[PDB]
Write an enzyme that holds these catalytic residues in place. Structure first.
Site, mmCIF file in Angstrom:
data_model
loop_
_atom_site.group_PDB
_atom_site.id
_atom_site.type_symbol
_atom_site.label_atom_id
_atom_site.label_comp_id
_atom_site.label_asym_id
_atom_site.label_seq_id
_atom_site.Cartn_x
_atom_site.Cartn_y
_atom_site.Cartn_z
ATOM 1 N N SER A 26 -10.170 17.486 -7.483
ATOM 2 C CA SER A 26 -9.044 16.745 -7.391
ATOM 3 C C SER A 26 -7.480 17.513 -7.282
ATOM 4 O O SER A 26 -7.296 18.424 -8.077
ATOM 5 C CB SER A 26 -8.849 15.605 -8.341
ATOM 6 O OG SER A 26 -10.075 14.948 -8.251
ATOM 7 N N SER A 104 -15.713 19.510 -10.340
ATOM 8 C CA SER A 104 -14.979 18.134 -10.645
ATOM 9 C C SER A 104 -15.196 17.036 -9.753
ATOM 10 O O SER A 104 -16.357 16.980 -9.557
ATOM 11 C CB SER A 104 -13.307 18.404 -10.760
ATOM 12 O OG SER A 104 -12.835 17.209 -11.414
ATOM 13 N N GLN A 105 -14.495 16.298 -9.010
ATOM 14 C CA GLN A 105 -14.637 15.290 -7.990
ATOM 15 C C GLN A 105 -15.761 16.141 -6.882
ATOM 16 O O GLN A 105 -16.325 15.209 -6.432
ATOM 17 C CB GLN A 105 -13.424 14.733 -7.155
ATOM 18 C CG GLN A 105 -13.652 13.570 -6.192
ATOM 19 C CD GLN A 105 -12.658 13.223 -5.453
ATOM 20 O OE1 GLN A 105 -12.921 12.521 -4.735
ATOM 21 N NE2 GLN A 105 -11.395 12.982 -6.267
ATOM 22 N N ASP A 159 -14.866 19.531 -22.440
ATOM 23 C CA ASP A 159 -14.532 19.164 -21.109
ATOM 24 C C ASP A 159 -14.936 17.646 -21.070
ATOM 25 O O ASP A 159 -16.203 17.380 -20.763
ATOM 26 C CB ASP A 159 -15.198 19.824 -19.982
ATOM 27 C CG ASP A 159 -14.820 19.392 -18.570
ATOM 28 O OD1 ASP A 159 -14.035 18.315 -18.407
ATOM 29 O OD2 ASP A 159 -14.876 20.083 -17.629
ATOM 30 N N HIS A 172 -11.256 21.474 -19.070
ATOM 31 C CA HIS A 172 -11.699 21.377 -17.475
ATOM 32 C C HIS A 172 -11.265 22.320 -16.612
ATOM 33 O O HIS A 172 -11.777 22.268 -15.440
ATOM 34 C CB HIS A 172 -11.233 19.686 -17.185
ATOM 35 C CG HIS A 172 -12.031 19.404 -15.870
ATOM 36 N ND1 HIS A 172 -13.313 19.224 -15.504
ATOM 37 C CD2 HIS A 172 -11.272 19.075 -14.628
ATOM 38 C CE1 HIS A 172 -13.178 18.627 -14.424
ATOM 39 N NE2 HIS A 172 -12.212 18.189 -14.072
#
Length: 197
Positions: A26, A104-105, A159, A172
């Site tokens: 992101s 992540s995303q 995370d 993260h």
């Protein structure tokens, strides 16, 4: 170094043997973000600059932070974009071995796209790496419809996205060493397992 479109730009008469499709995190820049260039440089060292094509997921995938909260952890438009890249690779270079990854995303996006992908195509993806996998707890560390032996998840202790939350804490942002070493090591090994050397 954060934008690579080697599949889109690539000549179909001179296909690479290996095509890597990667989705960024992101708010990250280009189509490879922070971790993709480190993976890419290590793949190019292993297979040579003409032996591997690096392709980030750009286009409609805007890597919008708020889209983490949507049902699949990304938008439908982003899934359509990454599906279309896997379909482009299969049409342009039918004998290439595919590899995939995301952060992540982008890890949720990779998992959703691989789930929805036709099996003819999905079965050509020799290995997938996921960093900070936001659907790790919900999918029990797996990509649906994809084998465990071809999947490697990097989920740091602390995370919180790996344990079912959408809070961004310091661990993260700490996947740099994994992107430099263990992640390209895994991808190289899984390609060599099917292609030889």
């Amino acid at each position: 170094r954060t934008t690579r479109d080697d599949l889109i730009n690539g000549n179909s008469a001179s296909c690479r043997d290996v095509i890597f499709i990667y989705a960024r995190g992101s708010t990250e820049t280009g189509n490879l973000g922070t971790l993709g260039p480190s993976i890419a440089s290590n793949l190019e060292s292993a297979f040579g600059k003409d032996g591997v094509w690096i392709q980030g997921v750009g286009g409609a995938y805007r890597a919008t932070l708020g889209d983490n909260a949507l049902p699949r952890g990304t938008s439908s438009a982003a899934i359509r974009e990454m599906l279309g890249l896997f379909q482009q690779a299969n049409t342009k270079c039918p004998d290439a071995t595919l590899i995939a990854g995301g952060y992540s995303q982008g890890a949720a996006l990779a998992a959703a796209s691989i789930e929805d992908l036709d099996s003819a195509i999905r079965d050509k993806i020799a290995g997938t790496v996921l960093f900070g996998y936001t659907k790790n707890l919900q999918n029990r560390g797996r990509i649906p419809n994809y084998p465990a032996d071809r999947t490697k998840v990097f989920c740091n202790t602390g995370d919180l996205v790996c344990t079912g939350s959408l809070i961004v804490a310091a661990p993260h942002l700490a996947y740099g060493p994994d992107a430099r070493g263990p992640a390209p090591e895994f991808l190289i090994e899984k390609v060599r397992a099917v292609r030889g050397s």
